[PDB]
Structures are given as C-alpha cells and as structure tokens.
Amino acid sequence: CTIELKDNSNANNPWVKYYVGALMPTIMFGGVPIGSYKVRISGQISLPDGVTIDSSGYYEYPNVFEVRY
Amino acid sequence: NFVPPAAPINIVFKAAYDLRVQWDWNRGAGANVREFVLSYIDSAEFVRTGWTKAQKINVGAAQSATIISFPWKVEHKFKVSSIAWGPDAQDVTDSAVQTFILNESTPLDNSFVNETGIEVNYAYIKGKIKDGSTWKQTFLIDAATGAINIGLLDAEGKAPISFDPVKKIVNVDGSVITKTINAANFVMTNLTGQDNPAIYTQGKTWGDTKSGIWMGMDNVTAKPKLDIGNATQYIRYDGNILRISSEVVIGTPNGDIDIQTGIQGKQ
Amino acid sequence: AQSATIISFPWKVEHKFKVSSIAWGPDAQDVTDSAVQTFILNESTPLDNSFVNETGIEVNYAYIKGKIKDGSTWKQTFLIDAATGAINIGLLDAEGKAPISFDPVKKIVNVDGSVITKTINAANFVMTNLTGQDNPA
C-alpha cells in the first residue's frame, strides 16, 4: 500500500506520497514538513500480469493533525 | 588523483606608509582553500636568494592583507599561496610573483583605512567593518565572560562561531576539520529540523555502491541503518531486516574441546 | 607555553612561586606542582632586559597581530583580522601554515592536530581521509 499526505492548512494543496511499502498493523515514517496534514491511504495489488495493478479508492482519516514537532 | 587548490587569480594594491594587498580567489572542481599565506621579500634579496629568509604574513583565509610601514622607494616581490588539506606533495599552490615598489606616482587610497574599525575597551575587544553609515561587529571578546564570537553577524544576529566558558562549551556552526579527535561521548544530534545524524566515511551513503561505512538514524523511515563493505561484499542492516552478503563463520574449530584430554579416532 | 610574565611586580617585597602541571586524567592526579621557590626584588637582583625584545604585540585598525623576534626579524605567530574576524594561531612552519584557524566566511574551523572534548554533539561524524595515506577509522 502507498500512503499520501496533504497540508490541510492551505485551502488547496496537492496530495503527496510519503510511504510506499507493505501494509502493516503499524506504519512508521518521517522526514515530513511541519504543517498540519490530511492523510489518505490506498492499497495496490498486482494482477498476475506484471503491468496491470489494481488500486483502491483512497480512504482518508476524518481527523486532521499537526505533525508532532 | 588529488587536484591542488587554485592560486589567486589577480592581485591589486592600495597605499596610504601602510600598504594593503588583496587577492581575488576563484575555484571550481578543485581543492577547497583553508588558509592563505603571503610572502614579501626585497627584489635585491630575491636576486640574491629565492624566497629564502623572506618575511611572511599569514591570514585565516582572508582575501585582503595589510602591511604597515612598507619601505619607501624600495623594490619588492610578493606571492600568494592557497592552502588545502591534501597531501604535502600538492598541499599548496603559489600564485605568480608580482613585483611592486612604493612610489610617489602611486595614487594614495586611504579609503581602506576608514572602511574598517577596531576598538580596545575595558568591557571588551571588538572589531567592526564600516558598511555605509553604520558599523557591523566582526568579532567580540567580553571581559566578564571569556566569550569570543567570530565572524560577521547574520541578519538574525546568529554569529558563525561562538564560545562559552560559563557552560564550558565551544559552539561552531558549520564544519570542523582535525587530524584526530579524542573524546568520551560521540553523541550524534539532530541539530536541524530535518537532519540525519550518522557517522560515515566521506562521500558514502547507505545502500550505495561505494566502499564506505554508514551508521546513523534515517529520519525518513525513522529506523536505524547500517552498511559495511563494498557493493558486493557488505553487511547491510535495516530496522526491518538484516542482510549479510559475505560468507560468515561462527565460532572457532575446537571451540569446545576438552583441555585436559584431546580427541582421536581409530579403526 | 614554557614561560610567563608578571607586569609591575612589587619591588622590595618577597613572593613565593609554584608552577602547576595540569594533564588530562583522574582528578586525584590531575595536577602536579613544581617545587616551592621564593623570590625578592632588590638591588641585589640583577636586571635582564633581554626578554623585552623578543615578544611583540601589534594593534591596529586593520588587525591585531602577535609577533616574535627570530634571527632579528619579527615572526608572526597569531593574527586577528579586524575585518571579518579571520583568526589564525601558532607559529608558521616551512611554507606559512597556522596549526589552528577559524574561517567565519566558510564556517570552517581548521585544526592541524587533535581536539579533546568530554562530549561532542555533531550531526555528521564524517570520516574523511585528509592526508590521503592514512586509512581513517
């Protein structure tokens, strides 16, 4: 699964991917700026054909939080 | 293949008695400069011998140099040599020799005299540079505390190098180059907001084809990292998984052999 | 330094002197003291004006420089540039080289020896090869 982020303080910001890896019960990542963010998570599963990959509808956490500084 | 530092491109002169010499330095894809030395000798002495027993003035990598009470109507020669941290063979590169003599025909430029400024005070010792109508502090030495700030102040007032005997700390922003260091605690710190503390050989990165060592905290993934070895033979560790490419041996032969009695076999 | 100077020492007054020897190590033996030797300033004490010539301090708007007479010539040992606060310390050997210097413009402090500190907090313990013939470790 891949995880994106977007700074919610501004009215409109582009969603940015920050973590790419296997889905886990707990995910740890860093190296992100200070602004408050909204988080959407999507999963991608590879079809038997290498080229084709089935993604998921982005699920977004309703809560919005500041990065712990 | 070590590229020696490039010598100063050009030399100019300003006079007042006092003589000022400043050399422009430009460099690209070469050794970085760490110190500048100027050697001045009399032309007749230069003919007698080459830069031998020639008085020299050293500066802490400062372009401009000042000579006070230069001889009047006497020929002289100068050279400016850049200094780097490479081996002694190509450590230093010297610029082209430029002759010069104090002459009544040389225009007198006393502006440099006013453009600087120093003061000795019971409170402290302070150096200033005249910038327009104001003066900017260069270095300070307080009497009450042995604090010595070195360098022109930042717009926000952050001094480049700072000291504090009160806290017994030496505070330097930037880099420190030493032949060796002795200490009791190499406590790496995430000084900047997004820094990545680590110890490594210069020009080495984790998961790279270089032949260095890397050890530190990867703030991007928030996991410790490690790598010892070249591209093929290496000991690479990530918080999730450890990989050891090279052949591994555990224990030693006869590790648990009886000391009092040996072993043997027969048929 | 192997020598010291006392300015305006009282005359006709006895004094006692001890020279310490501080070294890194256990606090119990951190210091060692020289033998106690007293002194008096009096006409019976010969005057030696030789030591005045060797030392030299130069103070100017341009910079502050300390100089030592070797072979009837001033030799620069440390210079404090008034402009930009460029500072270099130590006698010059062979081609002019200062063992210790500080460069505010490049934010680099160069030392040609060892630095000793109880603790060091650095975000990059980069392990360089300066001389090129010594494998760093």
Structure tokens at B220: 């991007």
Q: How far apart (Å, rounded) are the C-alpha atoms in residues C129 and B86?
A: 9
For chain A, what's the residue count?
A: 69
In 3D, which of C134, C107, C77 has the Cα closest to residue B88?
Answer: C134
Resolution in A: 4.3
DSSP letter string, chain C: ------TTPPSS--EEE--EEE-SS-GGGSEEEPPPEEE--STTS----HHHHHEEEEE-SSEEEEEEESSSSEEEEEEEETTTT-EEES---SS---SEEEETTTTEEEESSEEEES-B--S-EEE--SSSSS---
Q: How far apart (Å, rounded) are the C-alpha atoms in residues B67 and C76?
A: 12
Yes or no, beta carbons of B220 and A29 under 8 Å apart:
yes
H-only helix segments in chain B: 43-48, 111-115
Identify from C24, C68, C100, C117 which residue to disrupt to test chain B contact, counting B C-beta atoms within 10 A and taking the largest count: C117
Q: How far apart (Å, rounded) are the C-alpha atoms in residues B218 and A29?
A: 10
Strand partners, B261: none
Strands C74-81 and C87-89: antiparallel
| CA B142 to the chain's CA centroid | 25
Going by C-beta distance under 8 Å and a sequence separation of 6 or more, which residues neighbour residue C87?
Answer: B60, B139, B150, C78, C79, C80, C81, C101, C102
Q: How far apart (Å, rounded) are the C-alpha atoms in residues B230 and B119?
A: 56
Please give the C-alpha separations between residue B104 and each of B75, B107, B112, in angstroms, as whole numbers.
13, 8, 19
Q: Which chains would you list as touching A if contact means 3+ CB atom pairs under 8 Å?
A: B
CA distance between the termini of chain B: 64
Going by C-beta distance under 8 Å and a sequence separation of 6 or more, which residues neighbour residue B249?
Answer: none
Q: How far apart (Å, rounded) are the C-alpha atoms in residues A39 and A17?
A: 10
Structure tokens at B148: 């010595």
The DSSP H or E segment spanning B39 is: strand B35-42
The coordinates were experimentally obtained by cryo-EM
Q: How far apart (Å, rounded) are the C-alpha atoms in residues B48 and B33?
A: 31
Which residues of A sit within 8 Å Cβ distance of B? 28-31, 34, 69
Going by C-beta distance under 8 Å and a sequence separation of 6 or more, which residues neighbour residue A40?
Answer: A3, A4, A5, A6, A15, A58, A59, A60, A61
Strand partners, B125: B120, B141
For chain B, what's the residue count?
A: 267
| CB < 8 Å to C82, chain B | 116-118, 127-129, 138
Yes or no, beta carbons of A30 and B219 under 8 Å apart:
yes
Query: Residue B61 is nearest to which of C61, C86, C133, comparing CB atoms?
Result: C86
Q: How far apart (Å, rounded) are the C-alpha atoms in residues C19 and C41?
A: 19
Amino acid residing at B48: R
Q: Which chains would you list as touching C if contact means 3+ CB atom pairs under 8 Å?
A: B
CA distance between the termini of chain A: 26
